[PDB]
Amino acid sequence: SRRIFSGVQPTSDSLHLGNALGAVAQWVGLQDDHDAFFCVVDLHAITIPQDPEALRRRTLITAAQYLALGIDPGRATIFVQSQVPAHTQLAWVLGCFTGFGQASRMTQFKDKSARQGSEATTVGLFTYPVLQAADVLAYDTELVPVGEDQRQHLELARDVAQRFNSRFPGTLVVPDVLIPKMTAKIYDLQDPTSKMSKSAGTDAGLINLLDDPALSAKKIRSAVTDSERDIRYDPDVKPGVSNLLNIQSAVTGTDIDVLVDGYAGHGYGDLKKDTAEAVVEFVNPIQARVDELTADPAELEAVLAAGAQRAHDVASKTVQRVYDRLGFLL
Amino acid sequence: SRRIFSGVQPTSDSLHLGNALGAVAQWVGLQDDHDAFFCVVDLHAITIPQDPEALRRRTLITAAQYLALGIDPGRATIFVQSQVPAHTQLAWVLGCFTGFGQASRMTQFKDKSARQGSEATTVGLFTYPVLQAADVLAYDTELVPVGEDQRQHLELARDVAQRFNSRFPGTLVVPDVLIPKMTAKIYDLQDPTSKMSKSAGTDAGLINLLDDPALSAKKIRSAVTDSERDIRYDPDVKPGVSNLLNIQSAVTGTDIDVLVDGYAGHGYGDLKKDTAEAVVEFVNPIQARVDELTADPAELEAVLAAGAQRAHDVASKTVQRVYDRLGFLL
Ligand SMILES: Nc1ncnc2c1ncn2[C@@H]1O[C@H](COP(=O)(O)OP(=O)(O)OP(=O)(O)O)[C@@H](O)[C@H]1O
Ligand SMILES: Nc1ncnc2c1ncn2[C@@H]1O[C@H](COP(=O)(O)OP(=O)(O)OP(=O)(O)O)[C@@H](O)[C@H]1O
Ligand SMILES: CNC1=NC(=O)[C@H]([C@H](C)c2c[nH]c3ccccc23)O1
Ligand SMILES: CNC1=NC(=O)[C@H]([C@H](C)c2c[nH]c3ccccc23)O1
Numbered sequence: 001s002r003r004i005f006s007g008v009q010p011t012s013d014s015l016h017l018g019n020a021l022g023a024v025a026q027w028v029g030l031q032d033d034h035d036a037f038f039c040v041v042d043l044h045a046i047t048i049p050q051d052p053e054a055l056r057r058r059t060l061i062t063a064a065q066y067l068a069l070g071i072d073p074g075r076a077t078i079f080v081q082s083q084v085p086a087h088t089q090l091a092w093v094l095g096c097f098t099g100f101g102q103a104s105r106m107t108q109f110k111d112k113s114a115r116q117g118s119e120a121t122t123v124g125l126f127t128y129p130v131l132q133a134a135d136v137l138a139y140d141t142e143l144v145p146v147g148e149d150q151r152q153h154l155e156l157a158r159d160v161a162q163r164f165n166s167r168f169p170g171t172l173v174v175p176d177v178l179i180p181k182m183t184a185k186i187y188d189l190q191d192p193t194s195k196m197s198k199s200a201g202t203d204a205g206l207i208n209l210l211d212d213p214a215l216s217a218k219k220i221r222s223a224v225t226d227s228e229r230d231i232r233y234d235p236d237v238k239p240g241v242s243n244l245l246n247i248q249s250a251v252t253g254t255d256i257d258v259l260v261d262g263y264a265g266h267g268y269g270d271l272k273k274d275t276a277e278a279v280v281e282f283v284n285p286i287q288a289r290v291d292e293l294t295a296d297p298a299e300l301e302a303v304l305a306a307g308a309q310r311a312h313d314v315a316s317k318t319v320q321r322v323y324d325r326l327g328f329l330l
Numbered sequence: 331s332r333r334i335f336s337g338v339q340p341t342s343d344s345l346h347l348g349n350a351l352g353a354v355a356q357w358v359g360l361q362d363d364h365d366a367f368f369c370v371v372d373l374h375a376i377t378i379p380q381d382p383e384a385l386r387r388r389t390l391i392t393a394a395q396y397l398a399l400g401i402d403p404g405r406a407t408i409f410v411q412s413q414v415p416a417h418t419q420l421a422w423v424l425g426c427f428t429g430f431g432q433a434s435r436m437t438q439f440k441d442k443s444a445r446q447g448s449e450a451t452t453v454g455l456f457t458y459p460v461l462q463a464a465d466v467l468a469y470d471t472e473l474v475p476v477g478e479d480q481r482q483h484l485e486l487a488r489d490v491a492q493r494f495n496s497r498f499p500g501t502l503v504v505p506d507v508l509i510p511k512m513t514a515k516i517y518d519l520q521d522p523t524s525k526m527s528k529s530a531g532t533d534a535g536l537i538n539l540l541d542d543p544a545l546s547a548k549k550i551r552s553a554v555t556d557s558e559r560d561i562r563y564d565p566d567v568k569p570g571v572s573n574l575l576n577i578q579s580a581v582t583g584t585d586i587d588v589l590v591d592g593y594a595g596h597g598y599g600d601l602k603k604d605t606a607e608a609v610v611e612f613v614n615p616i617q618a619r620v621d622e623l624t625a626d627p628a629e630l631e632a633v634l635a636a637g638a639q640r641a642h643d644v645a646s647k648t649v650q651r652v653y654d655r656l657g658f659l660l
């Protein structure tokens with residue numbers, strides 16, 4: 001079994017290297033010997049105002065990038081969150097076991113609730129960590145492969161599951177968090193100590209999978225480095241250079257230490273071009289797959305339709321189990 | 331059509347006079363010329379820890395008291411909230427359009443968040459006004475018959491519906507609130523300026539429908555009055571006496587003004603006995619109906635099973651409408 005669950009929001013027209021290397025690469029490695037549910041979490045997207053035409057299109061292109069990155073619909077379940085009602089059913093129950101102060105200590109919330117503490121925060125922006133917990137717990141998930149930015153959220157999920165099981169033993173699976181080391185955080189290229197996010201202002205440090213490959217290669221060349229002319233791996237001291245080697249290692253397969261000793265005598269310029277070529281060679285097979293999946297959508301549609309059918313059969317059994325323990329009339 | 335929705339929590343083994351006169355009496359009058367959905371809102375109950383065996387039993391006895399008070403399963407839909415997944419689906423969406431500060435200004439929340447501001451509040455205790463909005467809006471409700479204690483919650487529902495329709499015109503029905511005048515608030519009998527709630531500490535001022543009728547009549551006799559020996563209706567000055575006449579008027583059908591001029595020359599003692607006899611005559615037909623509904627449950631079960639089927643057909647169409655406007659892949 002070794003049941004796995006993970007999700008990405010359809011908040012943009014393309015994943016970036018952080019999503020692909022910090023999350024989806026780990027999924028592709030897991031799917032062959034784990035029972036895997038990979039979700040496009042469109043209910044999370046609407047915590048921020050969303051254009052309806054874009055939201056539907058980005059939902060499909062997020063699932064398409066899953067397949068383009070190697071997710072295999074014969075080995076794994078891909079589905080759209082909003083199509084499985086159990087997620088919200090479980091999230092209401094779990095919110096009843098979640099401390100108010102526990103939810104207000106979440107970092108995302110204190111960011112937006114900093115400049116406009118009550119003026120611009122919504123309830124959804126306050127409670128989405130509880131819906132994230134329900135996303136995982138509805139599938140009896142044993143392991144959750146995520147980047148480091150999701151760690152605090154999933155500690156909340158584990159705590160609420162243990163609190164619930166304290167009242168009702170053996171109802172929910174408490175999941176283990178699986179965060180990588182090298183690819184745990186792909187950083188911005190114009191700002192080496194800040195996390196590559198879709199909401200970065202200027203995308204000149206952002207590397208989108210479906211962007212024009214020559215533009216992404218132009219951004220890699222413009223990456224902020226240091227001034228030591230020494231190519232080595234020290235992220236605390238060398239944020240830029242360690243990022244680029246981390247990227248090149250991830251898109252190729254070559255260990256960082258092997259890369260570093262090969263870069264003995266080499267300069268940052270050759271490290272940039274080399275990374276730029278590996279990335280261009282990485283994104284080009286993806287863009288061609290996405291373009292076929294976008295142009296011919298009966299294949300993608302059908303994967304998502306089988307996926308939601310399978311996800312509903314699992315997740316609704318969990319809800320019915322939780323409801324029976326709570327004492328609801330069934 | 332004139333679509334109606336209203337709900338009561340299964341938080342105790344009996345409704346009291348406030349529920350029956352402040353809410354259910356109004357429903358019985360409406361059901362014959364309105365399209366009515368009457369809900370036992372068991373998802374709201376679990377905002378407070380609930381014994382599973384009691385919660386299931388109180389859910390059934392709340393629906394039984396509906397029928398015992400005159401709700402007619404041929405003219406109205408009775409169902410259990412947790413059995414219709416659209417409620418939580420809509421509540422998540424609506425929370426994304428609800429201001430954080432708007433939800434924290436709700437009175438219930440500031441009560442519990444007063445002594446233990448973050449120590450004892452849960453997310454469910456903070457967000458249930460949003461689930462209450464979804465309860466109403468999922469059925470294209472035109473009118474909501476409630477007591478005065480629900481007014482602030484339903485202003486929130488109306489505001490979030492208008493905010494949602496602002497982005498997506500004509501999606502949600504904005505409901506009108508229908509609060510009575512006389513029976514708007516049945517007060518405690520040992521504390522005439524506080525609202526008869528199931529959580530009153532001492533039930534010596536609380537009049538439960540299914541309590542032993544002689545005990546409820548004993549509590550009516552012990553009602554706090556004044557010391558003016560004058561029987562008249564002035565709730566600001568005469569809180570006790572106006573309560574008792576309000577109760578007697580509601581359980582009989584006789585207008586208060588007609589009662590008052592009949593009580594010219596009479597003392598508070600005769601006002602109490604007279605109320606006690608009217609109540610005893612009121613609760614005894616209810617207890618006999620509930621006792622049959624409890625003892626023989628295939629009838630009740632079947633009403634709730636038809637009710638949830640009908641509620642799901644309506645409420646899921648609303649969700650699918652909201653989801654399509656939002657841009658979710660259907
Ligand atoms: N810079 C990053 N490096 C590594 N992993 C990342 C990075 N950003 C996001 N992830 C991971 O990608 C997955 C999807 O996260 P999510 O959908 O929130 O993307 P995001 O980049 O944070 O976008 P958004 O700005 O819309 O929140 C998660 O497992 C998350 O930890
Ligand atoms: N004292 C009262 N007088 C009149 N109506 C009341 C009174 N208390 C509750 N109601 C009405 O009864 C309906 C059901 O409310 P609810 O199920 O919350 O009951 P409650 O008496 O408040 O119980 P609880 O203490 O569990 O909240 C609502 O329409 C509410 O306005
Ligand atoms: C705004 N919502 C949100 N942001 C996040 O980073 C999480 C992600 C997208 C998420 C939701 N459900 C999940 C289940 C497993 C792993 C990540 C997520 O949710
Ligand atoms: C704790 N939840 C809660 N307390 C209340 O007074 C409301 C009531 C029970 C409610 C929920 N949904 C409704 C729909 C119509 C009228 C009242 C309610 O909810």
Ligand SMILES: [Mg+2]
Nearest residue numbers: 009149197198
């Ligand atoms: Mg994110």
Ligand SMILES: [Mg+2]
Nearest residue numbers: 339479527528
């Ligand atoms: Mg109440």
